[PDB]
Fold:
Amino acid sequence: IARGKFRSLTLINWNGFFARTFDFDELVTTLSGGNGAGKSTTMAGFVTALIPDLTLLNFRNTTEAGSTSSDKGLYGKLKAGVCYAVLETVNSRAQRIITGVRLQQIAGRDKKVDIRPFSLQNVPMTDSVISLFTEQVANKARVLSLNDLKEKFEETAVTFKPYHSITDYHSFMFDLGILPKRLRSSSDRNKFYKLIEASLYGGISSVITKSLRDYLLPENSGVRQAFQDMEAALRESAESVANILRKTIQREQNRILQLNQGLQNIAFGQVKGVRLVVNIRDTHSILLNALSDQHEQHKDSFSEALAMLYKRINPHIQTIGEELLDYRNYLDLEVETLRGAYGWMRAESSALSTGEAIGTGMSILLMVVQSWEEESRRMRAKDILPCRLLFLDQAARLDAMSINTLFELCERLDMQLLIAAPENISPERGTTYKLVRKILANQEYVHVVGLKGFG
Amino acid sequence: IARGKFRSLTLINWNGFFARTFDFDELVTTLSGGNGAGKSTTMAGFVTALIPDLTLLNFRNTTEAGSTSSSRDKGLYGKLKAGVCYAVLETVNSRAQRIITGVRLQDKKVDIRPFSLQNVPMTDSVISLFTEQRVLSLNDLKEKFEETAVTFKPYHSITDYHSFMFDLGILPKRLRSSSDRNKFYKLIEASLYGGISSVITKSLRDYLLPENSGVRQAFQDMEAISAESVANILRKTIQREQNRILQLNQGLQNIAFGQVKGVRLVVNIRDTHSILLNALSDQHEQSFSEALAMLYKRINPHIELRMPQTIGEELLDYRNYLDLEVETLRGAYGWMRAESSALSTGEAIGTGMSILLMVVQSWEEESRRMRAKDILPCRLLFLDQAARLDAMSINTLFELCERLDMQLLIAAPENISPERGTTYKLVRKILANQEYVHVVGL
Amino acid sequence: LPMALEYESLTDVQTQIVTAIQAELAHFRNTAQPINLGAVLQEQLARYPQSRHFDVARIIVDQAVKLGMASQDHQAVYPVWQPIDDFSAAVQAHLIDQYDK
Ligand SMILES: Nc1ncnc2c1ncn2[C@@H]1O[C@H](COP(=O)(O)OP(=O)(O)OP(O)(O)=S)[C@@H](O)[C@H]1O
Ligand SMILES: Nc1ncnc2c1ncn2[C@@H]1O[C@H](COP(=O)(O)OP(=O)(O)OP(O)(O)=S)[C@@H](O)[C@H]1O
Ligand SMILES: [Mg+2]
Ligand SMILES: [Mg+2]
Structure:
């Protein structure tokens, strides 16, 4: 079963980066360099190429991760004229894909910028990704606009398609397996973006802990739909629902049952394990237990009906009726970190150290994706597979033991990691891009060097 | 020519430590090892040693930088064991009188009560000044000293502890009220996590330019009138505290963080308030706090409320006249207002670290008045995860202490630590399922 | 509760490798003959065993840059993955031309 992988995030006319391609390794891609180099920003460009939605795009500083105080981060990292941020994909169908974002500053009065998602299909593996947005006049490069790209391809075996609504962009990447989740509604974009954001600043992404069940659980659009209908027929059923639930929950509980097993030999500092303990609200537990053994029938809206039933078990606190259908509502998810002390302990930042928290965090993220993908097998083909990739800016927080463990993992499940070592030492396995910000005529100018194959 | 510094932090019974002594370096101390080995925690008590205030002590985790979610556990409880625990420091006054400051430690809440130990001989390892052959409790220990030669003082209210440390020669500031301490701990926090202390920037003048408590008392009484004097006062109170800063700046000129070649404090005279001092300066027409409240009631702005003496009161606090700003340098446009969303991880800390010096420096001087002229307070900050700084970036930090006569406690999980200064290596391993940490130096 | 105190020394002759590599590359400064790391590397590896292969790389690179910067690096052209070894490892970087001071 073939699985797609990104090959190059080439940034154009960005801060300190003119035409610098970035080749991603099958597994790890480490950005080596000194302070204020271009590591983070390089990823910035990446992040952008996926979620070109400015609403969510906010590049704070790794010195502020819980900053619910929404100046920005995206403007500066680009220079005057036309810029880009593109991605090279190796679709499970060995199809090269050029999903990119075009950028260009705006009237200097307010740090505002513009975005136009675009893609390029059937791009002869002979031409370099960078030789798509360049010319040669008087021996000095010339970045070309999208209307320029159009013409250079208008009549060719190569197809080009500018987009208007992010959805068009997004949905496209998903159709070709670049995106794991269905990026339909905008609220969806939040979940995704925050994961990407979460991978960055590293740690136990708080925001993905409160709505912890909003990410790991498929709310079946089949349930509500098919279920309701049964009623449309009934009018012109009893506990057949009760059966549906504890089997639908048993199902997903078996889903979660395994993903955990996928995380046992993980060792970060003291953390020797991360699980997704699935608990069922007593409130609903006795209800599921109620609509089973006992039987006090009141056949007078199944929705409405069920509601009254909550009055039975609940001597506390319509809408109760319906809500009480969805799989989720009958649960209470959580996360725990295995140690040598008190066996397993609910995940808690205040109780963990920098490293221990990042790993756990990474985990939770690993799980996020290892849920969205499969939860999408239906809406996908039997021959397409999404790409799995995460981040870990300032990966120096991880020693040797921790960092290494991160590797064996991506290898464990098939993934890629664009880590960044503010320090020069780092893993020998994988690709390494050493950066050096130079000054030529008082102009930024990053200096890249490649290394891969060592192993 | 005098100097005071830190000699050793001490833990007792703490989780993973039955009793350890970390001898503070002359210039820079560093902690390295494996993720979660006992680094931060070691500093945690250092922070808990200087500020034993459960209302302020809140060790969230790095990943959470600016978390206003004070709902969770302040996290310090599980950092120690149960029963009898201790936090103690070893500092040498400008007078060289070895001092011992620290505190005892013991839902999930924590009890704490401070203490001191004067006139104690040096030839005795404080380690045995709390250990017996076991730990001999607070009650056992007071007898130890009594007859012999030493001073242990069971502190009631926290105010005194500080009011004891400052009088001796440790705290670079008069921790009088909660107001005063709240700000302190915040700086220390800012040194622990790094970057531009979101808090300090929004209230710069509150951690730089002190109050001339007098201009307030003296002024009001008199009437029991004036003129261009009160106005005159402020001016020379501003230009004075302005040249103060001027110099504080001239020190941080050869900093080197990423692309930041400098930090500064742009002291500016508010448009609003500026107009007042130009009007009272040479012109005139028609509480004296009230009179002012009216002259300001001419210059028409936006926001407009107020009591005449709460206003004049605010226009007698020279500080409300100024509006500070922190700026960084770059090969680019160079002098630009610092901005978290601008500087990279490193740059951030470098700058952030700088300002804290403005704080301490300014503070130190802010109280040379109410302190023995022979003593020179000890200055020291922190920097957990310094692994985020590259060689050049770290070098500069070092060079600074040798410029600001100071000490810096850092911590890099990184296996590569400098060489300039003693360094400790910690390795935690399971033993009888009891958290244990092996402490060795390199 | 026992307690002693023992210090360990870390000896990294990595400093010599650097100095020898400094002059080895510095050698290129004197002469206008650029520093093609596709050759500087493919040759230098032949000296030290593959045990400390990686480390040697970084330093030749780290050093190869503190000395200058590619010229056709502003001509926007994807640098090809110039391979080395008989196995896998490779390097990506245009020749290093004009100097800095
Ligand atoms: N919004 C912005 N405005 C102006 N300059 C910016 C902005 N964002 C980034 N930069 C520039 O980019 C550099 C920082 O780049 P990054 O990619 O964050 O560096 P870094 O290599 O990640 O540094 P660390 O995190 O310290 S390891 C600075 O030197 C800035 O001049
Ligand atoms: N609130 C707590 N309750 C119980 N144990 C705790 C708590 N906070 C931390 N710990 C333990 O202390 C260890 C972390 O100690 P620290 O000294 O903070 O580690 P650290 O080495 O500073 O972390 P880095 O920066 O990630 S390398 C973990 O292994 C935990 O088991
Ligand atoms: Mg820590
Ligand atoms: Mg950064």
Notes: The interface with chain B takes residues 1, 3, 5-10 of chain C (CB under 8 Å). The radius of gyration of chain C is 18 Å.
